[PDB]
Amino acid sequence: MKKYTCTVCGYIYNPEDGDPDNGVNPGTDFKDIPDDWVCPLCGVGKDQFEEVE
Ligand code: NI
């Protein structure tokens, strides 16, 4: 699974770590994160995140 970066603040979503405190368990594909989830650091939505190739 790919990392994704918040292009407003630079936060790196790492699948292998997830975001457990907001309910996204380790092992979760960015695409499967609930679409109401917001960047933990800056609060913007998935739509500002870009795949890291
Ligand atoms: Ni952010």
Side-chain angles (χ1 to χ4, degrees):
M1 313 183 275
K2 297 277 125 202
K3 297 177 186 137
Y4 281 68
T5 312
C6 180
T7 66
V8 147
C9 90
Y11 173 78
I12 292 251
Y13 178 72
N14 186 344
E16 282 217 340
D17 280 18
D19 185 14
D21 289 336
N22 299 285
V24 171
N25 302 356
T28 293
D29 223 18
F30 193 71
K31 84 106 164 149
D32 298 323
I33 298 183
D35 284 342
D36 57 333
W37 182 80
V38 296
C39 180
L41 304 187
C42 68
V44 308
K46 282 179 96 188
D47 80 320
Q48 305 296 327
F49 278 73
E50 294 214 320
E51 181 178 341
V52 168
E53 279 104 335

